[PDB]
Design a protein around this ligand. Structure first.
Ligand code: CLA
Ligand code: CLA
Ligand code: CLA
Ligand code: CLA
Ligand code: CLA
Ligand code: CLA
Ligand code: CLA
Ligand code: CLA
Ligand SMILES: CCCCCCCCCCCCCCCC(=O)OC[C@H](COP(=O)(O)OC[C@@H](O)CO)OC(=O)CCCCCCCCCCCCCCC
Ligand SMILES: CC1=C(/C=C/C(C)=C\C=C\C(C)=C\C=C\C=C(C)\C=C\C=C(C)\C=C\C2=C(C)CCCC2(C)C)C(C)(C)CCC1
Ligand code: SF4
Ligand SMILES: [Ca+2]
Ligand SMILES: [Ca+2]
Ligand SMILES: [Cl-]
Lengths: 744, 79, 140, 146, 52, 40, 154, 38
């Protein structure tokens, strides 16, 4: 399988066997000798995917990584097919599609036993189950699914694909294992990921939208009912069935090649607003967008030189960028991103988590799927879900930046490049970031404290409010104004605004509001500065962990200690948590804090100044009656009018289909309190307690041969932070879900 | 309220706009392409500037000429 | 006496000496190199040692010792002739490492024994037996 | 646990509605909503967007105890060395910022010690515990008058 | 400075433009203060240049 | 002295700045500069 | 030598860098000629000028944002706030000098001594009180300043 | 702020003294004592 390519594989490097499955710890030479202490077990899980600590061959590591990628893709295919099958044979997708505005999207039926059958609440049309917030029904309606058999077929295809990915992983780790030369083709890999994966993907999805999503949805919104819509392929068998909806189809693909594109203005629109029937983005707009994105990505996938002389050498581009401030510039970065997996992982985790948070922010205010803006639970759930995914990916980006610093950083190849100079003024960077975090904390949280003290003393006129000392976010208001004036001027062909959150019509579907102008005042200014503050503190922790992983004034030989170590003794005043791993540990807490305040802001602002009902007068009555302005300026406001008030749904959820949310609420509280034990103590006390219990077992000859050892310091920290995040996020999950499911 | 295009390419859109953009891109490639005849597939003799050094150079420069020509056509068509 | 050697080729950093070097004390590492090489700076970033003699000033003794371990453990012709001194603001220089021209890892004659207890660990006197004194079990 | 039990049972006894405690103290959600959430309603309204009543100090002190408790968490979870490195960067900053160079510390700034950090985190934890529970106790029992 | 600031208030107090207004003495004070400020700047510039 | 033009508060302070502050400051800088006995 | 960032004072092993912000001609000339660093000055003159400037600008915050800003005593309140903050700053300066120059006195510069730092504190106190009072006096009499600037009394 | 109790002029000046003068004096004395000799 050469085909005059740059492919180079090894025909049989690893034999297939089952014997190593019976030796837990084969990948670690320190664990192969068998357990003697309980720590042996824990480390077996800690280094499972730590391929660098298993072998010093970059080629074998790349092969393990490739096959692990295939395995993870098989797992995600299995999960996606499970979701599709549960929508197929276990959901009310058809009863919902027949009448969305009067039925709740349900899935996952519970077996009636031990009382748990109560969780299958009535969702409409006689269906009993658990209301789902993932928004799968809206996505499937956007895709054009009409029959549950098609969800079943998608599940079958996904399971077939999962088997394919698993076979591919096995085949490329045991049969044809690609060489290290093949992975280092970053120019080719980039060309393909831009053109083949992204370009072709959006191109085919635009085609599917034009042939399946757009016609079916055009009819669906007009009330034609699902069972009366012809099948998606009857539109391909009958061109007149496509020309009746879009007369532009009657001219064929002749205007396309002749650049006569305007003819296609029937199905390739630039409406901008929302669909008045369902409250989602126009599928014509999404298809046009996918077409443009596909062309852009395909054109981008031609920049880099591969096997034909034409193209861009990324090494030459990086080395050609150097100025008076930065020395030799990006020289040596090609060698880093070609010989180091952790540098790539850090960059990609950072950008992917940012993209995920951007996805959350762009989907909450521009509802792309039909009838997703009406459902407040699904909106809030998707928002916070992508928020947390992005936060975790960013913390992991910091972790792997530090890992690269400790393991793959070579000072001999980083002589006066960007990384070298950053290491040479990290003190300035971190001191200024320290100051910026302090200035933000004083000038965001401190403003809330001022308001609390002034209101408590009976001095409302001395507060930072819209009615006293105003903090008007003038710039955001100006940009919103510019957005509301773009269609017709700075956006000539666009029919409406990009989003009504900046302003415009208060689009409402059914009895509820879909999207109205989101006003910004003093409380919004304060919350945005809280956001900046928390983001800065988290980034400070992570960046200091990365830059000081190799050395510091305290520990000039920190690199030799490794990336993951508890400390370097109680000397030098005390050196606990000096490692980069411990910086990731702290950045985890601060990411949790930042994202928690972000999602709380989202929930309260949407429920207060956006979400609500609309009576046949134009007048809007919001969920919690616009209390954001006068209450979100003090901490007591967030305690009373947000936490105390909106947790009434979660606490009184017993005896209904939401009692599980109260159960998980208490469970998250308990897991936070449980984490506190791992976070506040030390290993020595637990080892002494284990010594006493081991004596007690010696009294009756129940002493295990594997000596019980207390959790290591690093493991104690990992367990504590894992339980802390789990408990807090599950608490807010239950709270948000119950609240947004008990507001209509 | 759509941007007006042109249907048949006839004498204006083709030759006068598309082919001239292709020739401009061919000149820009012949001047600025670093590796011109480094492709694994070689071109047939030399002839003129319609195609001279390597099939990949001609293919890439025709693609860039098509980009330029589509842009200039949809521009002069008033958008 | 007078410390000799060329400073390593370095563009500068913010992790070097502070006011302590001139108010309190400073340290110096000297070493001979078989060629112009690149080493890692204990204060962050990379530097270039010259072929021949190299003299480098650092803020703390542990930094010089980290540089010494790196010289002796990370280069093809191992640099082990390095010397570490302590410099005072009066210009005084106190030779430090290796103390007796031989690394402390391996035994060498002429060295006295300090901090050596003739007894065992578990044979320390009970604290109550030495209370209301200025001593601890590991001191008498 | 002592004071929660005592206060919930005694609130029930004083209001004559011992049924609430006797029937809801069996599951922990009963404690979460009928004791903590409920008796807080008065306290958290000592001051609000509408004015101030006699529970303003108690609400403010409730939030004060929350703040002090979390600040204790700060010292308890994060351990010295990180802070010593941060303080080292801040020391670098001060020595190199003009005008402020006219001024120098008499004592070299260093991070709190390990035992000191435990003591300080625990001190904040205990201050917050006592103050927030005292605020809740007083405000609830006084706004209900038992 | 005591002697000079004391006597410099007079000229503008009795002969300045605000002498025939409700702000006569305030006008004199403002004039004398501005003059003493300029004089201080002159003295300081002199010191700066002659003792290098 | 008044002003119906926009931002007529600008001359109010700009005239003393252009007439007093800028001249005094620039003459002081130039006096110091032309009297500096550095090298030559 | 296209690089604009170099070692500080020709020593790459001192914890600093020479940058356009830290060690450029403009920064050297401006910072070096502020009253704190201007060559030849006596500590009391440095203190006087610094205090003048600080007492002057410290009038504003409480004048426009303090509790008496909405009263018939706005300017007086801003004045009082400025004077008290300057008194606390003066006590701080005096105490700093008291503890930092206890033993032998260096010969480098007069500011970095016990006597010199106390003289700088006296200058700061006097200048700060004076500048705060002149700012308050200008604000209280803004109407006569307005008539002076518009030629209303001609 | 007022007080129908007798000597209501006493807290008038006594609250600043306990809150400003006394703390400033004690903190200054203790600061000088902390940083004594050298
Ligand atoms: C993607 C992961 C995933 C997850 C989290 C679930 C989750 C669940 N499934 Mg599902 N399922 C999945 C994939 C998944 N499924 C796939 C890929 C298929 C296609 C083969 C199915 C087909 C399927 C069926 C047919 C049923 C479930 C059922 C269930 C529920 C009980 C499972 C059980 O106790 O079986 C048994 C457990 C052991 C043998 C141990 C449970 C909440 C049951 C259910 O929903 O009851 C109404 C059930 O009948 N699932
Ligand atoms: C057009 C060519 C092409 C395509 C589409 C891909 C696509 C992909 N690559 Mg690959 N790659 C390519 C060229 C291509 N690559 C070349 C030329 C090289 C050599 C330099 C590499 C070397 C490379 C490496 C080393 C790795 C990848 C990885 C990945 C996957 C990560 C992204 C992801 O998970 O998205 C979403 C996932 C999916 C949509 C699942 C579908 C996967 C199927 C099997 C591939 C697409 C179908 C196939 C093209 C047939 C289509 C026919 C029909 C549908 C029209 C992804 C599916 C990474 C990986 O394995 O991640 C798991 C990885 O480690 N690529
Ligand atoms: C594509 C993303 C990606 C990739 C491939 C890697 C890859 C790697 N990481 Mg990294 N990292 C990532 C994201 C990623 N990480 C993220 C998002 C974070 C933030 C949390 C981190 C933070 C991080 C740290 C702190 C460390 C690593 C480490 C490692 C290496 C060891 C893997 C391991 O620990 O074994 C297997 C993993 C485990 C045994 C952990 C299992 C714990 C589970 C997931 C608890 C979570 C609960 C679950 C989600 C829900 C509750 C269910 C429960 C009730 C049953 C490995 C090469 C380690 C290292 O030393 O690097 C060399 C290490 O110390 N990473
Ligand atoms: C509510 C709890 C809490 C609070 C108060 C703080 C406080 C702070 N943390 Mg921390 N943290 C916490 C929890 C908390 N943490 C926990 C649980 C952990 C464990 C994961 C951490 C771990 C952590 C790390 C790793 C870091 C911080 C950082 C910071 C500082 C950020 C800079 C700033 O905002 O400027 C100052 C803000 C304040 C001091 C807030 C209080 C301001 C009040 C309202 C004003 C007081 C008025 C007046 C002075 C009172 C006078 C009293 C009178 C009697 C004299 C800040 C002082 C970062 C840092 O150091 O910043 C650079 C940092 O790196 N934290
Ligand atoms: C003489 C050649 C020419 C002319 C007069 C135009 C004219 C125009 N172009 Mg075009 N364009 C050109 C060359 C030209 N272009 C080329 C060579 C390319 C390829 C890079 C493009 C790619 C391009 C894009 C991507 C877009 C335009 C757009 C536009 C219109 C919007 C102008 C604006 O300021 O906004 C405008 C009428 C915009 C448009 O079509 O408006 C909808 C727009 O989207 N042009
Ligand atoms: C932003 C920096 C700054 C600031 C806040 C001040 C502030 C002040 N200076 Mg100073 N000065 C500065 C920089 C500064 N200076 C520098 C760099 C120099 C060296 C050239 C001087 C040299 C200087 C002298 C010789 C004197 C002052 C004096 C004063 C006070 C009189 C008010 C005044 O001059 O109007 C405000 C000034 C400004 C808004 C512009 C400041 C920057 C320019 C370059 C200052 C130029 C000084 C100039 C020759 C004197 C002004 C003449 C006067 C009539 C205003 C005042 C509080 C006088 C004083 O009473 O000292 C005790 C005086 O004698 N300054
Ligand atoms: C909490 C932040 C804050 C707040 C709210 C204020 C508030 C205020 N500031 Mg301040 N300021 C601040 C921070 C702040 N400041 C900071 C950080 C700085 C830099 C250190 C300054 C520096 C500054 C200066 C230099 C001045 C103010 C002034 C003012 C007042 C102007 C309003 C006014 O009277 O309108 C109307 C406008 C006027 C009254 C202008 C006054 C006319 C001037 C004095 C004429 C001088 C020009 C002339 C050339 C003088 C040379 C004469 C010479 C030849 C003898 C106001 C109350 C002004 C003031 O105090 O007025 C007396 C003023 O002079 N501020
Ligand atoms: C420990 C006892 C104690 C306590 C906690 C208080 C509490 C208080 N007093 Mg009172 N006071 C006390 C004893 C006490 N008093 C006695 C015995 C007298 C008669 C001599 C007074 C006469 C007095 C007056 C006239 C006033 C107060 C006032 C006040 C309030 C503000 C403090 C102040 O400004 O006055 C300062 C207190 C004094 C000058 C009296 C000295 C206090 C005793 C004799 C010494 C306490 C020492 C004790 C060991 C504490 C040391 C600190 C500790 C860490 C060791 C405050 C709530 C003010 C008020 O009414 O608030 C509205 C006020 O006007 N007190
Ligand atoms: C209130 C109105 C006033 C607004 C003014 C605000 C701008 C002034 C401060 C901006 C900093 C300018 C320096 C960057 C411009 C810049 O990058 O210059 C370029 C320079 C490097 O350029 P080279 O010439 O080396 O380019 C060659 C490259 O190809 C090789 O790297 O970077 C530096 O000088 C390092 C210093 C960066 C450290 C400064 C960052 C500070 C963060 C600022 C955050 C504030 C805004 C954040 C919003 C997201
Ligand atoms: C522009 C600019 C800048 C800035 C500046 C600032 C930020 C500020 C300053 C300002 C200020 C801060 C000013 C001031 C002034 C002050 C004064 C002018 C004073 C005074 C005093 C007097 C006049 C007197 C008084 C008195 C006495 C002492 C005695 C008795 C009483 C009385 C009152 C008479 C710089 C250069 C940096 C850079 C460039 C640009
Ligand atoms: S307390 Fe634990 S982490 Fe800290 S120095 Fe001691 S052993 Fe190391
Ligand atoms: Ca007021
Ligand atoms: Ca007159
Ligand atoms: Cl409130």
């Amino acid at each position: 399988r050469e085909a005059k390519a740059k492919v180079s594989v090894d025909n049989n490097p690893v034999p297939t066997s089952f014997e190593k499955w019976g030796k837990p710890g084969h990948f670690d030479r320190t664990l192969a000798r068998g357990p003697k202490t309980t720590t042996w077990i824990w480390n077996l899980h800690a280094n499972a995917h730590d391929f660098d600590s298993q072998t010093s061959d970059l080629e074998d590591v790349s092969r393990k990584i490739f096959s692990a990628h295939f395995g993870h893709l098989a797992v995600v295919f299995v999960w996606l097919s499970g979701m599709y099958f549960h929508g197929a044979k276990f959901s009310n997708y058809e009863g919902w599609l027949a009448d969305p505005t009067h039925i709740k999207p349900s899935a996952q039926v519970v077996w009636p036993i031990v009382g748990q059958g109560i969780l299958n609440g009535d969702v409409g049309g006689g269906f009993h189950g658990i209301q789902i917030t993932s928004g799968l029904f809206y996505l499937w309606r956007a895709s054009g699914f009409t029959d549950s058999y098609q969800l079943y077929c998608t599940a079958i295809g996904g399971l077939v694909m999962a088997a394919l990915m698993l076979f591919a992983g096995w085949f490329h780790y045991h049969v044809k294992a690609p060489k290290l030369e093949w992975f280092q083709n970053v120019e080719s890999m980039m060309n393909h990921h831009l053109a083949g994966l992204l370009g072709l993907g959006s191109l085919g999805w635009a085609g599917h939208q034009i042939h399946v999503s757009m016609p079916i949805n055009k009819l669906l919104d007009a009330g034609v009912a699902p069972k009366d819509i012809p099948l998606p392929h009857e539109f391909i068998l009958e061109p007149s069935k496509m020309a009746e909806l879009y007369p532009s189809f009657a001219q064929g693909l002749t205007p396309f090649f002749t650049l006569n594109w305007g003819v296609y203005s029937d199905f390739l629109t630039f409406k901008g607003g929302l669909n008045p029937v369902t409250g989602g983005l126009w599928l014509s707009d999404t298809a046009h967008h996918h077409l443009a994105i596909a062309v852009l990505f395909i054109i981008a996938g031609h920049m880099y030189r591969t096997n034909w002389g034409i193209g861009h050498s990324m090494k030459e581009i990086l080395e050609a960028h150097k100025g008076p401030f930065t020395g030799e510039g990006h020289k040596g970065l090609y060698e880093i991103l070609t010989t180091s997996w952790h540098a790539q992982l850090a960059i990609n985790l950072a950008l992917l988590g940012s993209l995920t948070i951007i996805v959350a922010q762009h989907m909450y205010a521009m509802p792309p799927y039909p009838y997703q803006a009406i459902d407040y639970a699904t909106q809030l759930s998707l928002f916070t879900h992508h928020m947390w995914i992005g936060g975790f990916l960013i913390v992991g980006a910091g972790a792997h930046g530090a890992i690269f610093m400790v393991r793959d950083y070579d000072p001999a190849k980083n002589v006066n490049n960007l990384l070298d100079r950053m290491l040479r003024h990290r003190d300035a960077i971190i001191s200024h970031l320290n100051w910026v975090c302090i200035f933000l904390g004083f000038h965001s949280f401190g403003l809330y404290i001022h308001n609390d003290t002034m209101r408590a003393l009976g001095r409302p006129q001395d507060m930072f409010s819209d009615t006293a000392i105003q903090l008007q976010p003038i710039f955001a208001q100006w940009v919103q104004h510019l957005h509301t004036l773009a269609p017709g001027a700075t956006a000539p062909n666009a029919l409406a605004t990009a989003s009504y959150a900046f302003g415009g019509e208060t689009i409402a579907v059914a009895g509820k509001v879909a999207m109205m102008p989101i006003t910004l005042g003093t409380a919004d200014f304060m919350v945005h500065h809280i956001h900046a503050f928390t983001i800065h503190v988290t980034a400070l922790i992570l960046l200091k962990g990365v830059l000081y992983a190799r050395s510091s004034r305290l520990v000039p030989d920190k690199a030799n200690l490794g990336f993951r170590f508890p400390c370097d003794g109680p000397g030098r005043g005390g050196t606990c948590q000096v490692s980069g791993w411990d910086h990731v540990f702290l950045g985890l807490f601060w990411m949790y804090n930042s994202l928690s305040i972000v999602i709380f802001h989202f929930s309260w602002k949407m429920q207060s100044d956006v979400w609500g009902t609309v009576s046949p007068d134009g007048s809007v009555t919001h969920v919690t009656l616009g209390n954001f302005a006068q209450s979100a300026i003090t901490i007591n406001g967030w305690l009373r009018d947000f936490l105390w008030a909106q947790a009434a749904n979660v606490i009184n959820s017993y005896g209904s289909a939401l009692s599980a949310y109260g159960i998980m609420f208490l469970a998250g509280h308990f897991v936070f309190a449980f984490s506190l034990m791992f976070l506040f103590s030390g290993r020595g006390y637990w080892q002494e307690l284990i010594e006493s219990i081991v004596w007690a077992h010696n009294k009756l000859n129940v002493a295990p041969a594997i000596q019980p050892r207390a959790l290591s310091i690093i493991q104690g920290r990992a367990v504590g932070v894992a339980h802390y995040l789990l408990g807090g996020i599950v608490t807010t999950w239950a709270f948000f879900l119950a609240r947004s499911l008990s507001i209509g | 309220a759509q941007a007006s295009p042109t249907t048949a390419g006839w004498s204006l859109s083709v030759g006068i706009i598309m082919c001239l953009c292709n020739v401009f891109a061919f000149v820009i490639g012949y001047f600025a392409i670093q590796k011109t005849g480094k492709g694994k597939d070689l071109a047939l003799p030399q002839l003129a500037s319609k195609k001279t050094f390597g099939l990949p150079e001609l293919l890439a420069t025709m693609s860039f000429g098509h980009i330029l020509g589509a842009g200039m056509v949809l521009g002069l068509a008033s958008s | 006496t007078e410390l000799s050697g060329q400073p390593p080729k370095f563009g500068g950093s913010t992790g070097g000496l502070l006011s302590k070097a001139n108010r309190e004390e400073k340290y110096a590492i000297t070493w001979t190199s078989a060629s112009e090489q690149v080493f890692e700076m204990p204060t962050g970033g990379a530097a270039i040692m010259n072929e021949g003699e190299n003299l480098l000033y650092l803020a703390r003794k542990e930094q010089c010792l980290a540089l010494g371990t790196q010289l002796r453990t990370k280069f093809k012709p191992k640099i082990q002739d390095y010397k570490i001194y302590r410099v005072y603001p009066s210009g005084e220089v106190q030779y430090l490492h290796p103390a007796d021209g031989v690394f402390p890892e391996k035994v060498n004659e002429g060295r006295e024994a300090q901090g050596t207890k003739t007894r065992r660990i578990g044979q320390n006197p009970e604290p109550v037996t030495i209370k209301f004194s200025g001593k601890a079990p590991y001191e008498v | 646990w002592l004071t929660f039990y005592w206060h919930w049972k005694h609130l029930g006894v004083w209001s004559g509605n011992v049924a609430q405690f006797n029937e809801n103290s069996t599951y922990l959600m009963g404690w979460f909503r009928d004791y903590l959430w409920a008796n807080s309603a008065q306290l958290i309204n000592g001051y609000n967007p509408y004015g101030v009543n006699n529970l303003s100090v108690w609400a403010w002190m409730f939030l004060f105890g929350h703040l002090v408790w979390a600040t204790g968490f700060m010292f308890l979870i994060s351990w010295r060395g990180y802070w010593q490195e941060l303080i080292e960067t801040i020391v670098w900053a001060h020595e190199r910022t003009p005008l402020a160079n006219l001024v120098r510390w008499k004592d070299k700034p260093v991070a709190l010690s390990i035992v000191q950090a435990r003591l300080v985190g625990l001190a904040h934890f205990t201050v917050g515990y006592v103050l927030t529970y005292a605020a809740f106790l007083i405000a609830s029992t006084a706004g209900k008058f038992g | 400075g005591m002697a000079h600031g004391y006597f410099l208030i007079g000229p503008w107090t009795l002969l300045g433009p605000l002498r025939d207004s409700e702000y006569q003495y305030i006008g004199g004070l403002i004039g004398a203060l501005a003059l003493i400020l300029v004089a201080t700047a002159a003295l300081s510039s002199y010191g700066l240049v002659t003792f290098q | 002295m008044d002003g119906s033009y926009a931002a007529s508060y600008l001359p109010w302070i700009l005239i003393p700045m252009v007439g007093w502050l800028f001249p005094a400051v620039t003459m002081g800088l130039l006096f110091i500069h032309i009297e500096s006995e550095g090298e030559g | 030598s296209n690089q604009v960032v170099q070692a500080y004072n020709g020593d790459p092993f001192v914890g600093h860098l020479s940058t356009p912000i830290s060690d450029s001609a403009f920064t050297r000339t401006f910072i070096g000629n502020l009253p704190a660093y201007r060559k030849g000055l006596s500590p009391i003159l440095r203190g006087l000028e610094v205090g003048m400037a600080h007492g002057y600008f410290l009038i504003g915050p409480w004048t426009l944002l303090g509790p008496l800003r909405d009263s018939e005593y706005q300017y007086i309140g801003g004045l009082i706030g400025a004077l008290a903050l300057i008194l606390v700053a003066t006590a701080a300066l005096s105490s700093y000098g008291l503890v930092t120059f206890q033993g032998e006195q260096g010969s480098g510069d007069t500011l970095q001594t016990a006597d010199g730092w106390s003289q700088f504190a006296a200058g700061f106190f006097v200048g700060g009180m004076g500048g705060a009072f002149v700012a308050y006096f200008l604000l209280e009499n803004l109407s006569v300043v307005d008539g002076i600037f518009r030629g209303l009394f001609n």
